[PDB]
Design an enzyme around this catalytic site. Sequence first.
Site, PDB file in Angstrom:
ATOM      1  N   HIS A  77     -41.113 -29.239  -7.977  1.00  0.00           N
ATOM      2  CA  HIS A  77     -41.363 -30.575  -8.512  1.00  0.00           C
ATOM      3  C   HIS A  77     -42.856 -30.884  -8.786  1.00  0.00           C
ATOM      4  O   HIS A  77     -43.162 -32.005  -9.221  1.00  0.00           O
ATOM      5  CB  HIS A  77     -40.700 -31.611  -7.588  1.00  0.00           C
ATOM      6  CG  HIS A  77     -41.196 -31.544  -6.172  1.00  0.00           C
ATOM      7  ND1 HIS A  77     -40.617 -30.770  -5.183  1.00  0.00           N
ATOM      8  CD2 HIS A  77     -42.257 -32.158  -5.612  1.00  0.00           C
ATOM      9  CE1 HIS A  77     -41.316 -30.925  -4.053  1.00  0.00           C
ATOM     10  NE2 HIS A  77     -42.313 -31.765  -4.304  1.00  0.00           N
ATOM     11  N   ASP A  85     -46.468 -34.494   4.629  1.00  0.00           N
ATOM     12  CA  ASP A  85     -46.941 -33.310   3.897  1.00  0.00           C
ATOM     13  C   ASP A  85     -47.727 -32.360   4.785  1.00  0.00           C
ATOM     14  O   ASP A  85     -48.661 -32.783   5.493  1.00  0.00           O
ATOM     15  CB  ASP A  85     -47.846 -33.733   2.766  1.00  0.00           C
ATOM     16  CG  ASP A  85     -47.122 -34.383   1.627  1.00  0.00           C
ATOM     17  OD1 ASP A  85     -45.951 -34.721   1.734  1.00  0.00           O
ATOM     18  OD2 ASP A  85     -47.824 -34.575   0.616  1.00  0.00           O
ATOM     19  N   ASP A 110     -45.562 -28.261  -0.493  1.00  0.00           N
ATOM     20  CA  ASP A 110     -45.469 -28.068  -1.932  1.00  0.00           C
ATOM     21  C   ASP A 110     -45.951 -26.629  -2.271  1.00  0.00           C
ATOM     22  O   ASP A 110     -47.077 -26.239  -1.875  1.00  0.00           O
ATOM     23  CB  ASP A 110     -46.459 -29.031  -2.586  1.00  0.00           C
ATOM     24  CG  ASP A 110     -45.969 -30.489  -2.542  1.00  0.00           C
ATOM     25  OD1 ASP A 110     -44.801 -30.717  -2.889  1.00  0.00           O
ATOM     26  OD2 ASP A 110     -46.822 -31.366  -2.216  1.00  0.00           O
ATOM     27  N   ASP A 130     -38.527 -35.153  -2.185  1.00  0.00           N
ATOM     28  CA  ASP A 130     -39.650 -35.416  -3.076  1.00  0.00           C
ATOM     29  C   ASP A 130     -39.424 -35.357  -4.601  1.00  0.00           C
ATOM     30  O   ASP A 130     -40.308 -35.859  -5.311  1.00  0.00           O
ATOM     31  CB  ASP A 130     -40.871 -34.572  -2.683  1.00  0.00           C
ATOM     32  CG  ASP A 130     -42.209 -35.236  -3.060  1.00  0.00           C
ATOM     33  OD1 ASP A 130     -42.300 -36.483  -2.991  1.00  0.00           O
ATOM     34  OD2 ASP A 130     -43.146 -34.468  -3.320  1.00  0.00           O
ATOM     35  N   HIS A 137     -43.360 -31.247   4.776  1.00  0.00           N
ATOM     36  CA  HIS A 137     -43.187 -31.084   3.320  1.00  0.00           C
ATOM     37  C   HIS A 137     -44.267 -30.128   2.771  1.00  0.00           C
ATOM     38  O   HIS A 137     -45.464 -30.486   2.780  1.00  0.00           O
ATOM     39  CB  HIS A 137     -43.188 -32.437   2.621  1.00  0.00           C
ATOM     40  CG  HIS A 137     -42.954 -32.334   1.154  1.00  0.00           C
ATOM     41  ND1 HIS A 137     -41.771 -31.866   0.636  1.00  0.00           N
ATOM     42  CD2 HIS A 137     -43.716 -32.713   0.102  1.00  0.00           C
ATOM     43  CE1 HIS A 137     -41.841 -31.900  -0.688  1.00  0.00           C
ATOM     44  NE2 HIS A 137     -43.014 -32.406  -1.032  1.00  0.00           N
TER      45      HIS A 137
END
Length: 1016
Positions: free
Chosen positions: A442, A312, A63, A175, A61
């Site tokens: 997000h 993550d 971000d 997420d 994951h």
Amino acid sequence: QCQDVVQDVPNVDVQMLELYDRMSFKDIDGGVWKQGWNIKYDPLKYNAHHKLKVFVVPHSHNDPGWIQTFEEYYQHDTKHILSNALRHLHDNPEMKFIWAEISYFARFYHDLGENKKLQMKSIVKNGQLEFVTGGWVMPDEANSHWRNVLLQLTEGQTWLKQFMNVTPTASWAIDPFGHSPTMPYILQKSGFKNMLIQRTHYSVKKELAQQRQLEFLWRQIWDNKGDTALFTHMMPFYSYDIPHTCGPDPKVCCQFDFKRMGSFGLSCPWKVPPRTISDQNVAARSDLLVDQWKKKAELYRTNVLLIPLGDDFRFKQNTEWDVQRVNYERLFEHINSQAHFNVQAQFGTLQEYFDAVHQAERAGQAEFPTLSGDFFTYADRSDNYWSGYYTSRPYHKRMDRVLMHYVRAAEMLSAWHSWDGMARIEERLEQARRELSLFQHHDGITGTAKTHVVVDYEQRMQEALKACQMVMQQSVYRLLTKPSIYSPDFSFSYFTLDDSRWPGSGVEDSRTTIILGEDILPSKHVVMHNTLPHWREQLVDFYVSSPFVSVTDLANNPVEAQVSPVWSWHHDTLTKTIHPQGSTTKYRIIFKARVPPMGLATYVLTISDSKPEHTSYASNLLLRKNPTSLPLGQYPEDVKFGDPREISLRVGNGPTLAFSEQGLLKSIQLTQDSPHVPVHFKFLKYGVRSHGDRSGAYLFLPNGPASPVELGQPVVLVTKGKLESSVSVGLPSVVHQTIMRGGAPEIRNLVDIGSLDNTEIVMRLETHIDSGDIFYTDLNGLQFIKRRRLDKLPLQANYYPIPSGMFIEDANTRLTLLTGQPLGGSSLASGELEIMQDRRLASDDERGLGQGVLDNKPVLHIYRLVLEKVNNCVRPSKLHPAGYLTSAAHKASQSLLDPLDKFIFAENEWIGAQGQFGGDHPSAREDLDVSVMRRLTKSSAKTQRVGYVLHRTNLMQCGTPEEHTQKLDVCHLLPNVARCERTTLTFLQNLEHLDGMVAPEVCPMETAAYVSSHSS
Ligand SMILES: O=C(Nc1ccc(Cl)cc1)O/N=C1\N[C@H](CO)[C@@H](O)[C@H](O)[C@H]1O
Ligand SMILES: [Zn+2]
């Protein structure tokens, strides 16, 4: 021919509003699966001819901004993950990996040499590296506008088709904080076949798991037939990390995250570390892990099981790739060779999993349930509802909506022509699309990033707005200058944009004054752009250096105008009041611009030495005890003063509004014959809990119902004009303004929460509408969904995203509040609407951010408030889960989100100026929009291609007779059409070659894309 979206209630297996009404939300300790129960399975379910097929799907994951910026993460983490992925997958043919975030993949791929690009292409081609979703980001689903969801999906998928020759058909959304049916709406219309979601309320996970309804065909709430359905897999457990993906017991699953043995600084909080798999323990370890998989499989209907394996920023280190891969390979070899498990396990990709599930479905293993509704508001545990991020960092939420419009306007204006490469139009538009797309992450628009990351997003969006301005103004110069006179220089500023509502009065003195004078420059051209595909009239305003200004059109026809002072508000630390000051050097001129569909109109402002024939002047009244004068330079009308009192105003033929002595609306009378309907604005504050869980960027944990802001004796400023009137009041933390232009009022709040730590400011409307427990909120600006306030849920659970609007109604009356920015809101009692304005939180809310929200800045929120008689409207029945706007409310929403654009000619003389562009464009029915117009080809292409996305909303029928309107055929908007095709909404696949090169208009609630090809 079109489905009726109003009058038939779809029959579905799970309808989320109905499920909410019945469900228990009790938070009971379920054992090792804390929010579930102890799963039992029949060991004999599996045997030699019916094996459990397990797909272990490695993922990471990433971000695009959160606790670090996009570029910080790329340098520190993501470049290493992708470099190591390429190496390890290349070297290990059975290893697989899925990748979601195309922003990072493109950032990486363009630093790769040719050899590594070919290697990368090889592991995509052979299915080892699989892109899932393929959007620029994994977007927020609450605050994002559907147009931007589509924008970022298109950005990523266009990149993947161009550079990797792949288009994902499976989406991965592990997420976003709650999930919207806007996603399957867009995905299903973009070629997708399957989607996966994760952050849904723990009570919903338990409820659906018990019924094996975690995989469902998710259709839209109004869809009776099911044509919109998309197969959806909901993950069952608390997180997407390895401890919550192998099965119900995280103490066991954690032992199968081989990064947690010590050398990577990670461990298992359940106190049992993973152990290396060897011949001495492989049977025991396999037994443990298979039992977890078999429990997880009990929650699903096929013999095919999805086991994500990631967390993550995982798969960063070479040694991490080795430790996970080698230990799992040892498990697979043992498990698969030992018939007594009746398991066949392997690394897989997401598409592999879904393909196998559908194979099982086709074999008659299972029939899947149908579902409609949404998955807000999410709670991950106890009463921790994630409604805080519907409002967090509202300045940037508003900036999102502004940039959304300027990207649309820049793409549309520049699409009419092909541009030389030297103009750099494609470069600037790609930059703007990518910055806006990044912000849909997000942790972007949600306002859940660290302070410095929010600043990075803000700077990026500021650059994107500049790029849009540059493209727009070059385009206007070209579209409105006689072709044989047009002499562009592509680095020059022909026009500047004038925007009255961003950043806004009191936020930034950004606006240019038009400087005119008898001795210097008598007149100035201004140009308005209308991105909507119908003729539009809208009042526009400009700052000018004199009040003695006349407006004409470009046939020199006088235009009625109104001049008003320029009022600004100041927290006057000497006198302790919030009060206005008028400019003595510039003035506002206001007039109605009329602009063609997707077109432009030129007007001229001209100075005179005295009051012009067709320009009127507003009166101004300052209501306050202890008044002092308010001089206004040359303004011809002296300000009047009065003690606070109730006042009423009416502009034109329109509603009459009454205001309290504190300058807040109290009532609306629609017509001379009608009653004064009570509609009262009030400002209140929520606080935070001293003991127990704290509100933060994500969570809204109020210490009880809000308390009224004590107003004192605020200063009220009344401006009364022929074209525009307003009442403004300086309240603590909010300058509140109601503006009347002859229909639904506009509300503007300049919100400055200052140093009010642990406070959330809410604006409430109180009416006599007997709405009971029902209200309606929109989802992504696309649809309105019925909400029911439930007293079995706490206040923060009854907050929902308000991305574009909300309404309450009874048998006779509706009150709709349209927003220019996404915020959180609710209806906490019959007849009430409320919407959060800003929040300042000094504590962290324990979701990984490690800070509160203490970086507030003044923001200008904008709204329209529409009160309507609705007893004549044909509405859905009581059991229908949708609501629909009226024409007036829909036009009011459009006025906020896509207002006319205003341009001021930047030099003294514009040679070859023209009065209009687009006079010949068809004026389409009011429910239809051209959401996107984008030229898809560079100027060297023989065959030019333009893409259009057409959206038709559904408006309530209330007895206004339908006028004839022209058919809009987008394929014939540009000359020399050679072909017209219907395509997926990303423009990447042709679905239908169109007869006569005519693009059909679409049904209510449908969105369609078309690409026109032109010989050039
Ligand atoms: O919450 C976290 N914290 C965390 C993250 C990485 C590491 Cl090495 C250690 C802790 O994880 N991830 C995330 N946490 C947030 C929600 O709690 C969310 O905003 C973010 O997008 C999501 O990715
Ligand atoms: Zn995330």
